[PDB]
Each structure stands twice: as structure tokens, then as C-alpha cells.
């Protein structure tokens, strides 16, 4: 149960804030877990997704393919990918949007800000697990 009064627990208010958030919060809302090869390497589960890296979806028509992110979309709230294409009735491939929380990140590409984010969360996760005592 929440103690902080200034955050609201009504469903109307949360959806309105969520869909009409600022740009910086929407990038954080668009995020996914790493594959276990990258979890041991970088020392984090969860990261926000960019146009550099590639991703791998379990369960679907497009089941179990890797492919790079062509475009993130924050208003439409979904991710376009290479490979993930059905053709039209016309002979024309069209990329098909998928929400990142269904998806695992298989490779990652560094940025000064991405390295600076990772070194924070590594040091944060070392403190919290020592506190809880696992």
C-alpha cells in the first residue's frame, strides 16, 4: 500500500499520465529484459530499447527470429523490427509492430548514456541484494 499522497491510485488519472507523459518517461516505459548471455555480462535484467540493438520474440506468427529495430514509436507505443514482415495482397512487405515487454534483447550497442546508465544500475543492484541478504 502507498504512503505518498501525491501519487494517485485512480485508474483514470494513471492512464492519462501514462499516455500523455513527457518524452523522457516514455523511453523508460518502452523497455525489456536481456537474454541470460547478456545478463551475466552486463549485470542487469531490465533496459530501455534503442534503434541500434536487436531483439527476439517468443510466441507468435513471427516466433523465434532475431532482428534489428528499425524504429521505436512512442505515441503508437510499439516497436518496428527488421524481418518481422507479412506481405500485403500486393507484393509489398510491411513491418509489423510489437510491444517490447513481450520481447527479449539478444544483442546491445553502447552509447555514452547507455554505459553511464548500466554502471549506475550495477552498483545499485549490489547494494540492494546485500540489504535484503540473499
Partner RNA sequence: UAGUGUGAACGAAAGAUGAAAAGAACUCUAAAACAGAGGGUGAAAAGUUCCUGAACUUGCUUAGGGUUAAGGCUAUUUAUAGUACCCGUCUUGAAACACGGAUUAGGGAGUUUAUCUGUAGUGCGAGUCUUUGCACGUUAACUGUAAAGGCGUAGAGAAAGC
Partner RNA sequence: UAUUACAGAUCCUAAUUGAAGUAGCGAUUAUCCAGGCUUGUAUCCUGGGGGCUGAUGAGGAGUAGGGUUUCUGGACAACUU
Partner RNA sequence: AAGUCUCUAAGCAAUGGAUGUCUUGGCUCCUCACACGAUGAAGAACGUGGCAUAAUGUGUUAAGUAACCGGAGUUGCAAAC
Binding site for RNA (CB under 7 A): 3, 11-12, 15-16, 19-20, 22-24, 26-27, 48, 50-51, 71-76, 86, 88-90, 94, 96-97, 111, 113-114
Kindly tell me which of 23 and 131 has the beta carbon lying closer to RNA: 23
Kindly tell me which of 19 and 46 has the beta carbon lying closer to RNA: 19
Kindly tell me which of 89 and 132 has the beta carbon lying closer to RNA: 89
Kindly tell me which of 72 and 81 has the beta carbon lying closer to RNA: 72
Closest approach of RNA to the CB of residue 134, in Å: 28
How far apart CA 23 and CA 73 sit, in angstroms, is 11
Instruction: Classify residue 83 as left (phi > 0), alpha (psi -120 to 50) or beta.
Output: left
Closest approach of RNA to the CB of residue 132, in Å: 23
How far apart CA 115 and CA 45 sit, in angstroms, is 15
Q: 79 near 72, Cβ under 8 Å?
A: yes
Long-range contacts (CB closer than 8 Å, 24 or more residues apart) made by 24-27: 26/74, 27/72, 27/74
Amino acid at each position: 500500500v502507498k504512503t505518498n499522497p501525491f501519487v494517485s491510485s485512480q485508474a483514470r488519472k494513471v492512464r492519462k499520465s501514462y499516455f500523455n507523459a513527457k518524452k523522457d518517461a516514455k523511453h523508460v516505459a518502452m523497455s525489456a529484459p536481456l537474454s541470460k548471455e547478456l545478463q551475466e555480462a552486463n549485470g542487469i535484467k531490465r533496459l530501455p530499447i534503442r534503434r541500434d540493438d536487436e531483439v527476439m520474440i517468443f510466441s507468435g506468427r513471427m516466433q523465434n527470429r532475431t532482428g534489428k529495430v528499425t524504429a521505436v514509436k512512442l505515441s503508437e507505443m510499439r516497436i518496428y523490427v527488421d524481418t518481422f514482415t507479412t506481405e500485403k495482397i500486393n507484393g509489398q512487405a510491411v513491418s509489423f509492430p510489437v510491444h517490447p515487454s513481450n520481447v527479449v534483447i539478444t544483442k546491445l550497442k553502447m552509447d555514452k548514456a547507455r554505459k553511464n546508465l548500466i554502471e549506475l544500475r550495477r552498483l545499485g543492484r549490489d547494494q540492494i541484494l546485500a540489504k535484503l541478504g540473499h
